[PDB]
Design a protein around this motif. Structure first.
Motif, PDB file in Angstrom:
ATOM      1  N   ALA C 314       0.850  -1.189   0.000  1.00 41.91           N
ATOM      2  CA  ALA C 314       0.000   0.000   0.000  1.00 41.91           C
ATOM      3  C   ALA C 314       0.886   1.239   0.000  1.00 41.91           C
ATOM      4  O   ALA C 314       1.193   1.797   1.057  1.00 41.91           O
ATOM      5  N   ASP C 315       1.293   1.668  -1.191  1.00 42.30           N
ATOM      6  CA  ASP C 315       2.006   2.926  -1.359  1.00 42.30           C
ATOM      7  C   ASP C 315       1.346   3.723  -2.473  1.00 42.30           C
ATOM      8  O   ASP C 315       1.434   4.954  -2.510  1.00 42.30           O
ATOM      9  N   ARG C 316       0.665   3.022  -3.374  1.00 41.28           N
ATOM     10  CA  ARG C 316      -0.026   3.636  -4.497  1.00 41.28           C
ATOM     11  C   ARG C 316      -1.395   4.193  -4.127  1.00 41.28           C
ATOM     12  O   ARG C 316      -2.108   4.676  -5.013  1.00 41.28           O
ATOM     13  N   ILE C 317      -1.779   4.139  -2.862  1.00 40.03           N
ATOM     14  CA  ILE C 317      -3.115   4.576  -2.457  1.00 40.03           C
ATOM     15  C   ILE C 317      -3.111   6.094  -2.312  1.00 40.03           C
ATOM     16  O   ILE C 317      -2.192   6.643  -1.688  1.00 40.03           O
ATOM     17  N   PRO C 318      -4.087   6.798  -2.877  1.00 39.16           N
ATOM     18  CA  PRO C 318      -4.182   8.245  -2.658  1.00 39.16           C
ATOM     19  C   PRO C 318      -4.604   8.561  -1.235  1.00 39.16           C
ATOM     20  O   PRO C 318      -5.214   7.746  -0.542  1.00 39.16           O
ATOM     21  N   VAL C 319      -4.270   9.773  -0.800  1.00 38.16           N
ATOM     22  CA  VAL C 319      -4.525  10.202   0.568  1.00 38.16           C
ATOM     23  C   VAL C 319      -5.296  11.515   0.574  1.00 38.16           C
ATOM     24  O   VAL C 319      -5.062  12.401  -0.254  1.00 38.16           O
ATOM     25  N   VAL C 320      -6.234  11.623   1.506  1.00 38.73           N
ATOM     26  CA  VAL C 320      -6.909  12.877   1.814  1.00 38.73           C
ATOM     27  C   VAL C 320      -6.787  13.102   3.312  1.00 38.73           C
ATOM     28  O   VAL C 320      -6.104  12.343   4.010  1.00 38.73           O
ATOM     29  N   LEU C 321      -7.439  14.139   3.824  1.00 36.15           N
ATOM     30  CA  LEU C 321      -7.284  14.504   5.222  1.00 36.15           C
ATOM     31  C   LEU C 321      -8.542  14.218   6.029  1.00 36.15           C
ATOM     32  O   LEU C 321      -8.469  13.473   7.009  1.00 36.15           O
ATOM     33  N   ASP C 322      -9.685  14.790   5.627  1.00 38.81           N
ATOM     34  CA  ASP C 322     -11.013  14.545   6.212  1.00 38.81           C
ATOM     35  C   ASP C 322     -11.041  14.861   7.711  1.00 38.81           C
ATOM     36  O   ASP C 322     -11.250  13.990   8.558  1.00 38.81           O
ATOM     37  N   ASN C 323     -10.832  16.094   8.014  1.00 35.92           N
ATOM     38  CA  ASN C 323     -10.881  16.504   9.406  1.00 35.92           C
ATOM     39  C   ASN C 323     -12.218  17.173   9.728  1.00 35.92           C
ATOM     40  O   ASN C 323     -12.907  17.648   8.822  1.00 35.92           O
ATOM     41  N   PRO C 324     -12.634  17.163  10.996  1.00 36.46           N
ATOM     42  CA  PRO C 324     -13.853  17.874  11.371  1.00 36.46           C
ATOM     43  C   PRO C 324     -13.692  19.363  11.167  1.00 36.46           C
ATOM     44  O   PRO C 324     -12.563  19.892  11.187  1.00 36.46           O
ATOM     45  N   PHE C 330      -6.565  24.219   8.768  1.00 31.92           N
ATOM     46  CA  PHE C 330      -5.120  24.110   8.922  1.00 31.92           C
ATOM     47  C   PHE C 330      -4.548  23.072   7.971  1.00 31.92           C
ATOM     48  O   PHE C 330      -3.392  22.656   8.132  1.00 31.92           O
ATOM     49  N   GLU C 331      -5.345  22.634   6.998  1.00 32.79           N
ATOM     50  CA  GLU C 331      -4.898  21.616   6.060  1.00 32.79           C
ATOM     51  C   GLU C 331      -3.792  22.148   5.160  1.00 32.79           C
ATOM     52  O   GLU C 331      -2.848  21.420   4.842  1.00 32.79           O
ATOM     53  N   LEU C 332      -3.860  23.428   4.784  1.00 34.36           N
ATOM     54  CA  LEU C 332      -2.773  24.009   4.003  1.00 34.36           C
ATOM     55  C   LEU C 332      -1.519  24.167   4.854  1.00 34.36           C
ATOM     56  O   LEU C 332      -0.400  23.964   4.366  1.00 34.36           O
ATOM     57  N   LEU C 333      -1.695  24.469   6.139  1.00 34.83           N
ATOM     58  CA  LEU C 333      -0.572  24.689   7.035  1.00 34.83           C
ATOM     59  C   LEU C 333       0.119  23.389   7.407  1.00 34.83           C
ATOM     60  O   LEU C 333       1.301  23.404   7.757  1.00 34.83           O
ATOM     61  N   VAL C 334      -0.591  22.265   7.331  1.00 31.81           N
ATOM     62  CA  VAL C 334       0.042  20.963   7.501  1.00 31.81           C
ATOM     63  C   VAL C 334       0.415  20.340   6.156  1.00 31.81           C
ATOM     64  O   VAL C 334       1.164  19.351   6.124  1.00 31.81           O
ATOM     65  N   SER C 335      -0.043  20.914   5.042  1.00 36.64           N
ATOM     66  CA  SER C 335       0.260  20.396   3.717  1.00 36.64           C
ATOM     67  C   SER C 335       1.209  21.280   2.920  1.00 36.64           C
ATOM     68  O   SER C 335       1.328  21.094   1.705  1.00 36.64           O
ATOM     69  N   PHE C 336       1.866  22.257   3.557  1.00 34.34           N
ATOM     70  CA  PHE C 336       3.106  22.779   2.982  1.00 34.34           C
ATOM     71  C   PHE C 336       4.134  21.666   2.839  1.00 34.34           C
ATOM     72  O   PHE C 336       4.884  21.615   1.859  1.00 34.34           O
ATOM     73  N   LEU C 337       4.173  20.764   3.812  1.00 35.64           N
ATOM     74  CA  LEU C 337       5.057  19.610   3.817  1.00 35.64           C
ATOM     75  C   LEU C 337       4.434  18.506   2.965  1.00 35.64           C
ATOM     76  O   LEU C 337       3.473  18.725   2.223  1.00 35.64           O
ATOM     77  N   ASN C 338       4.962  17.290   3.068  1.00 31.17           N
ATOM     78  CA  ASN C 338       4.480  16.192   2.242  1.00 31.17           C
ATOM     79  C   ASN C 338       3.184  15.608   2.811  1.00 31.17           C
ATOM     80  O   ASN C 338       2.547  16.174   3.703  1.00 31.17           O
ATOM     81  N   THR C 339       2.785  14.453   2.289  1.00 30.74           N
ATOM     82  CA  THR C 339       1.529  13.798   2.600  1.00 30.74           C
ATOM     83  C   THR C 339       1.778  12.418   3.199  1.00 30.74           C
ATOM     84  O   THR C 339       2.784  11.777   2.884  1.00 30.74           O
ATOM     85  N   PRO C 340       0.879  11.929   4.073  1.00 29.91           N
ATOM     86  CA  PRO C 340       1.062  10.588   4.649  1.00 29.91           C
ATOM     87  C   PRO C 340       0.799   9.455   3.666  1.00 29.91           C
ATOM     88  O   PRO C 340       0.526   9.700   2.490  1.00 29.91           O
ATOM     89  N   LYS C 341       0.863   8.207   4.135  1.00 26.99           N
ATOM     90  CA  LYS C 341       0.917   7.047   3.251  1.00 26.99           C
ATOM     91  C   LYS C 341      -0.313   6.149   3.325  1.00 26.99           C
ATOM     92  O   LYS C 341      -0.215   4.981   2.932  1.00 26.99           O
ATOM     93  N   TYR C 342      -1.457   6.665   3.789  1.00 24.80           N
ATOM     94  CA  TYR C 342      -2.680   5.886   4.036  1.00 24.80           C
ATOM     95  C   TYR C 342      -2.389   4.721   4.990  1.00 24.80           C
ATOM     96  O   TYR C 342      -2.253   3.559   4.608  1.00 24.80           O
TER      97      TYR C 342
END
Lengths: 72, 320, 649, 73, 73, 73
Positions: C314-324, C330-342
């Motif tokens: 599982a590395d080819r899986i796309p990732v989103v955030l889905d926060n309340p 703050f998704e842009l402020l945590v997504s200046f950096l890279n993205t997690p791996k599902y």
């Protein structure tokens, strides 16, 4: 009355040495700024803001100097 | 002056180059797909129409806009260390103007691709009673030609032996100017390049038998006088002797084509090492020589795409 | 919490493939996949659809080029369903109009710029040479030259006929019009000698340097008297062309981008001759929309809603955030950096639970909070006006949704800086001087203060212990979270590294607090036992070496939380000292130059505001970014960014 | 009591000298790039002078600290 | 006997000045590479201001020790 | 107080300032190469930050020795 001079040499040492620090910073930043201006006129504001950003050094040095002046 | 200022721009420009899947998928098309694939990239900023002079003018104009800028933008030691990469163009223009003055065909004859000097110097530097005056008006201060042409100008005014000693003086002067300052990744590169230059000179002067030590220079390290002579005469175990050196897979090679292919591959390999020094001069070296490799490979793929040549004629020339 | 991201497999016939890919691309909430190697072909699309694709891309490039030629920028709109040759009849006349006008006016500006700079020397030499326009005996060497060095260039004429060969510069001293006239060969050789002394003939482009000077000067007078009228008229017609063509051309640009996106994604399928199949990824809160959209087709062609294969492979899986939505902006402020791996922890709620609360401890001035509230109400009025924020000094153009997120973070930050301006007790630096609103026993005027923050004998040890305590909580939470994520995927080295850093760090902290802190060296030594025993047990049951130099930097990361109190005291007593100097030297020196000292202290206070609030705004978020995010990983293999079918709209 | 005038004076002199060293290190590379820009073209003269004369703030601050100490003397 | 206040004040000034020299040495090359990334394209703005404003921890740690010393003075 | 309180403070502040000078020397070149690697592409951010902020252990060690000397008096 013996320690009244040594607070002032501490004052002068803080002022001069922080001036040295931001002189070292403004050397390379102003060299890059003059290079960018010699490329085009359109990088004026960015050169001024990057050049005036390292004055934090000397205003904090003046803060320490005025601490040591307000004590004396 | 500052190496990091130029290195930031060079790393930005190295961020935008063409990948391997580009020509690997452009290895089989019919020149309209070539115009299609070059419509998007940064070489399409100067593409006027369509056809071969348009593509060639686009590649030369983008290379002059994207590579000929970095000899400027610094002042002092940084430009003295970065100007000795893209300086073959100035030698080619100067020897073209030299043979044009020694021929009699008009000054508007040659095309004069841009090197490191502005062309008003070229327009002014044809009329001179003394060729020392031509070298004087050619002289920007710390330039290698400005102190090489007046060095080997000390015999006559305008001959061809002057041009041969100009080429030899240029090579040894660029090597000495690399030795004369401190860049630990450019001195070894220019030594290996001038070793490659007189090695392939010895290969392309095989069979003649004329005096080799007048042609052999000094500044390389992998070869010497006796290997140069025994390579000019026909036995190639000496070319098989060069092991441990980066001349690694290059052994038993006779013809000029496979030789020059191997030399261009080893120069691009040893010049891609320049990310070892991400602050000094190695990174702009690994940018400029990768850029010229990409430019000449783009040119050869353009020729194949237009003239419909087989991919088996080109497959050996994208090997590195 | 990252959405569970189920798999969607579809199949069917190929006309229905293009139609269902249209109906899937209109409701664009699905990611794609290659699906090559097994039992199907690579789907070379079609020759006629390839021609239609390259023609649509030519339409898109021509429309966007016409738009950038017009000068505006390319924003989407709603598209229009209409025929392709109707789109050609829409595109080509306005393209022809704008292209002919940008040939005409730009070459007009070329001719006008080359004309206006050289009207008067040419007209001057025409009035000087009105006795020989193009007479066939003597060429007229013109040279618009420098100041009074006329003998230096007339030395060639002195070498020529001195009692003849008329050569001078009459007037128009901006450039001395050195005209030379003798003969043909005499003037040619004297012009060669003058160029050896420095001279050049007026050989320019257009009509001036290609024809005789009298009629060319008349043509330059004609262009000088005509061209600004065409300047104004072509600006007026390009303004009309903008105002009544930009809408339909950017609408067909949206249509063209939609068509190019659909056809270039159409090659991501797999088919032979009686049917196709494709695969995609759908987040789980998009299942009813895709289900009702794919309920339209032929006999409700067969979907496979696969629950996605697990964390192995599982590395080819796309990732989103889905926060309340309280933590959403703050998704842009945590997504200046890279993205997690599902399968990596969703990092986004801890920055609302921590970062404004730390920035309160940075900035404890009620006046700073009021100025932030003023710029926040300004910026919320700016999103009420629905303008994209533009500044060409920074080349910052951005959309109002990011600006609304900036409103949200600014309000959720300014509450904590209000409450830590209350507890620290500082109004705009120090305006407790006249009205003693904050109660210290040295001047008790009103309600008390919780901590004084200007002296250090009362403040510094408590504040420095709490500043270390927040780092203790943060780093122990991070290492526990890395141990959790190692326990999840059945990968054991992460579990051992987490429990090893936890044990070693608590052992070093207990040994520090015992042997360098207070007395009572009895109870904590068993905790030192436990901590270093767990650390040695981890290194023995790990063989994951070079953790031993890391534990020193790990204590560095738990201890480097001093900087919140450091910049707090720095900015606080800096503002207090500035308003102290201004208020004292204004009030007790003069009593009526108090407005002088008040406004110069105000402008210097706003100067240090503008000059260091960037820095002590940046400090808490780099504290988070280089302690907490890098403890539990977050810097491995970059994940894979979820981009759906766009339908740019 | 003594041993105060000399020590405030060595603080004064150390401040002036060391701030002069700071703006010297700045104006070294700034004036080098400025002379390079002037040797390229004469159009950018005033911007070269304003980037060269921006770090006089350092030494007028140093002379400010010196004269504050001397008024204290 | 009286050798307390002056010597703690010169410790204060020495800490502040020497940490100031440290972050000046850092921000010199970092701001040089920052302007080298800015003047090519203006899309590296925030991701160069983060690196320029990152070394401002050093002077405020020096100011922390300075303000502790002023509390003991 | 005497010579004790005065001289322990300059032993504190010299350590803080000089360790800050050390990490400024480190973060100068590391920030230069980091701004480079970011200016190539916005993908090396998570590695440029960790390699950039590996040298801050020096100044937390300086603050550790400083707080030991503060609690020492």
């Amino acid at each position: 009355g013996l320690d009244r001079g040594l607070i002032a040499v501490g004052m002068g040492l803080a002022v001069g040495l922080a001036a040295l620090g931001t002189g070292v910073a403004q050397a390379r930043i102003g060299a890059a700024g003059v290079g960018a201006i010699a490329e085009d006129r359109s990088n004026f504001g960015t050169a001024l803001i990057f050049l005036l950003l390292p004055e934090t050094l000397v205003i904090f040095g003046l803060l320490i100097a005025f601490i040591l002046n307000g004590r004396l | 002056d500052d190496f990091a200022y130029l290195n930031a721009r060079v790393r930005v420009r190295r961020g935008t180059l063409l990948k391997e899947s580009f020509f690997q998928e452009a290895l089989d098309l019919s020149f309209a797909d070539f115009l299609r694939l070059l419509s998007e990239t940064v070489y399409g900023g100067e593409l006027a129409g369509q056809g071969l002079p348009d593509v060639d003018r686009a590649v030369l104009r983008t290379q002059a806009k994207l590579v000929g800028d970095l000899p400027r933008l610094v002042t002092g030691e940084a430009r003295e260390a970065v100007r000795l990469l893209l300086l073959r163009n100035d030698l080619h223009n100067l020897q073209a103007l030299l043979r044009a003055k020694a021929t009699g065909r008009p000054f508007e004859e040659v095309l004069l691709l841009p090197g490191t000097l502005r062309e008003e110097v070229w327009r002014q530097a044809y009329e001179a009673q003394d060729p020392a005056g031509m070298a004087q008006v050619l002289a920007v201060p710390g330039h290698p030609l400005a102190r090489a042409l007046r060095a080997v100008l000390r015999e006559t005014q305008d001959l061809a032996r002057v041009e041969a000693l100009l080429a030899k003086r240029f090579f040894e002067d660029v090597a000495k100017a690399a030795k004369g300052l401190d860049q630990p990744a450019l001195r070894d590169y220019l030594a290996l390049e001038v070793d490659a230059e007189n090695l392939r000179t010895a290969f392309k002067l095989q069979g003649s038998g004329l005096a080799p030590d007048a042609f052999f220079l000094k500044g390389g390290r992998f070869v010497d006088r006796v290997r140069f002579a025994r390579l000019m005469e026909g036995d190639y175990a000496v070319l098989d002797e060069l092991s441990g050196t980066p001349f690694s897979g290059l052994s038993g090679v006779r013809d000029l084509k496979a030789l020059e292919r191997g030399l261009r591959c080893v120069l691009l390999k040893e010049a891609k090492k320049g990310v070892q020094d991400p602050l000094g001069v190695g990174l702009v070296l690994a940018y400029v020589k990768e850029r010229e490799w990409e430019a000449v490979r783009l040119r050869l793929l353009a020729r194949r795409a237009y003239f419909g040549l087989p991919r088996a004629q080109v497959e050996e020339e994208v090997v590195c | 919490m990252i959405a569970p991201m189920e798999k969607l497999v579809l199949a069917g016939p190929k006309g229905r493939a293009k139609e269902l890919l249209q109906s899937l691309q209109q409701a664009g909430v699905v990611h794609l996949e290659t699906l090559r190697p097994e039992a199907l072909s690579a789907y070379q699309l079609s020759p006629e659809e390839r021609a239609e694709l390259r023609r649509w891309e030519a339409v898109s490039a021509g429309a966007e080029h016409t738009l950038s030629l017009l000068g505006l920028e390319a924003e989407p709109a709603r598209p229009f369903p209409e025929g392709l040759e109707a789109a050609e009849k829409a595109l080509s006349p306005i393209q022809a109009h704008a292209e002919g006008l940008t040939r005409q006016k730009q070459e007009l500006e070329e001719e006008l710029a080359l004309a206006q700079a050289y009207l008067e020397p040419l007209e001057r030499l025409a009035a000087l040479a009105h006795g020989l326009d193009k007479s066939p005996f003597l060429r007229v060497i013109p040279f618009l030259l420098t100041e009074k060095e006329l003998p230096l260039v007339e030395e060639a004429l002195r070498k020529a006929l001195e009692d003849r060969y008329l050569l001078a510069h009459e007037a128009y001293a901006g450039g001395v019009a050195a005209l030379v006239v003798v003969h043909r060969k005499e003037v040619d050789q004297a012009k060669a000698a003058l160029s050896r002394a420095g001279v050049a003939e007026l050989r320019l482009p257009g009509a001036l340097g290609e024809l005789p000077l009298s009629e060319a000067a008349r043509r330059l007078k004609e262009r000088a008297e005509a061209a600004p009228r065409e300047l104004s008229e072509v600006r007026q017609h390009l303004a009309k062309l903008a105002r009544e063509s930009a809408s339909t051309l950017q609408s067909l640009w949206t249509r063209a981008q939609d068509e190019v996106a659909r056809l270039k994604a159409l090659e991501e399928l797999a088919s032979g001759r009686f049917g196709f199949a494709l695969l995609g990824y759908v987040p789980v809160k998009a299942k009813p929309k895709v289900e009702e959209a794919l309920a339209r087709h032929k006999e409700s062609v067969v979907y496979a809603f696969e629950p996605v294969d697990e964390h192995h492979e599982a590395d080819r899986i796309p990732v989103v955030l889905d926060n309340p939505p309280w933590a959403k902006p703050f998704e842009l402020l945590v997504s200046f950096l890279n993205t997690p791996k599902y399968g990596t922890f969703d990092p986004t709620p801890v920055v609302p639970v921590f970062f404004p609360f730390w920035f309160g401890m940075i900035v404890g001035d009620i006046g700073y909070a009021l100025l932030f509230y003023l710029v926040g109400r300004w910026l919320s009025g700016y999103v009420k006006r629905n303008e994209p924020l533009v500044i060409d000094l920074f080349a910052l153009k951005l959309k109002p949704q990011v600006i609304g997120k900036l409103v949200h973070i600014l309000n959720w930050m300014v509450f904590w800086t209000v409450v830590w301006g209350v507890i620290y007790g500082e109004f705009f630096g120090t305006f407790l001087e006249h009205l003693g609103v904050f109660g210290t026993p040295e001047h008790p005027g009103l309600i008390p203060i919780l901590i004084h923050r200007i002296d250090t004998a009362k403040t510094a040890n408590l504040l420095i212990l709490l500043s270390v305590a927040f780092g203790v909580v943060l780093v122990f939470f991070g290492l526990a979270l890395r141990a959790y994520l190692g326990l999840k995927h059945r990968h054991m080295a992460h579990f051992w590294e987490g429990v090893g850093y936890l044990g070693g760090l608590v052992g070093v902290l207990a040994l520090a607090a015992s042997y360098l802190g207070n007395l009572q060296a009895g109870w904590l030594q068993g905790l030192m036992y436990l901590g270093f025993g767990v650390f040695l047990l981890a290194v023995l049951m790990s063989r994951i070496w070079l953790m031993i130099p890391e534990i020193f930097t790990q204590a560095g990361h738990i201890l480097s939380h001093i900087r919140i109190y450091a910049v707090g005291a720095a900015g606080g007593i800096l503002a207090g000292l500035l308003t102290d100097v201004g208020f004292a030297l204004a009030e007790r020196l003069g009593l009526l130059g108090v407005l002088l000292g008040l406004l110069v202290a105000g402008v210097l206070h706003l100067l240090i505001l503008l000059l260091t609030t960037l820095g002590h705004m940046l400090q808490p978020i780099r504290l988070l970014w280089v302690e907490f995010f890098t403890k539990f990983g977050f810097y491995e293999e970059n994940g894979r960014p979820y981009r759906p079918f766009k339908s740019v709209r």
